[PDB]
Design an enzyme around this catalytic site. Structure first.
Site: not given
Ligand SMILES: Nc1ncnc2c1ncn2[C@@H]1O[C@H](COP(=O)(O)OP(=O)(O)O)[C@@H](O)[C@H]1OP(=O)(O)O
Length: 124
Positions: A7, A10, A42-45, A66, A85, A119-120
């Site tokens: 994910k 992607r 709303p936002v993505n990198t 965060k 954005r 996760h970003f």
């Molecule tokens: N400290 C943290 N802060 C935020 N999200 C975290 C995290 N550690 C892990 N995550 C993950 O980062 C994913 C990020 O949420 P998301 O999948 O909507 O991605 P993103 O934040 O990159 O947009 C969560 O489903 C979680 O998945 P895992 O449990 O599979 O890692």
């Protein structure tokens, strides 16, 4: 099911382009990566570096996430990234974005074995 690591690839990885190619980059990318299917994200990198380079960040500078968790890491070097954005005039299902290129340090959360980005968190 799509794994957490997959994910992340992607939603955030785009090694096929060195920078934010055009003003229309975000509109095309947000759409093609399925980020506007349920609503407009709303936002993505997007990160324009090799997968190997981004994965290596998991062994770089440990910093607080965060959300308070401690599994975040900051890259020692700046990376080419593109911020998308959602512009106000964007109305689901016609999501609209402003494309912005920059070179900054990325912060990602890592998990699993292998310890990979899932996760970003931010760019600085
Ligand atoms: N400290 C943290 N802060 C935020 N999200 C975290 C995290 N550690 C892990 N995550 C993950 O980062 C994913 C990020 O949420 P998301 O999948 O909507 O991605 P993103 O934040 O990159 O947009 C969560 O489903 C979680 O998945 P895992 O449990 O599979 O890692």
């Amino acid at each position: 099911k799509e794994t957490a690591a997959a994910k992340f690839e992607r939603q955030h990885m785009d090694s096929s382009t060195s920078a934010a190619s055009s003003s229309n980059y975000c509109n095309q990318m947000m759409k093609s990566r399925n980020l506007t299917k349920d609503r407009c994200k709303p936002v993505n990198t997007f990160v324009h570096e090799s997968l190997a380079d981004v994965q290596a960040v998991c062994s770089q500078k440990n910093v607080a996430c965060k959300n308070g968790q401690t599994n975040c890491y900051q890259s020692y070097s700046t990376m080419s990234i593109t911020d998308c954005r959602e512009t106000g005039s964007s109305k689901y299902p016609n999501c609209a974005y402003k494309t912005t290129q920059a070179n900054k340090h990325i912060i990602v959360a890592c998990e699993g074995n292998p310890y990979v980005p899932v996760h970003f968190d931010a760019s600085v």
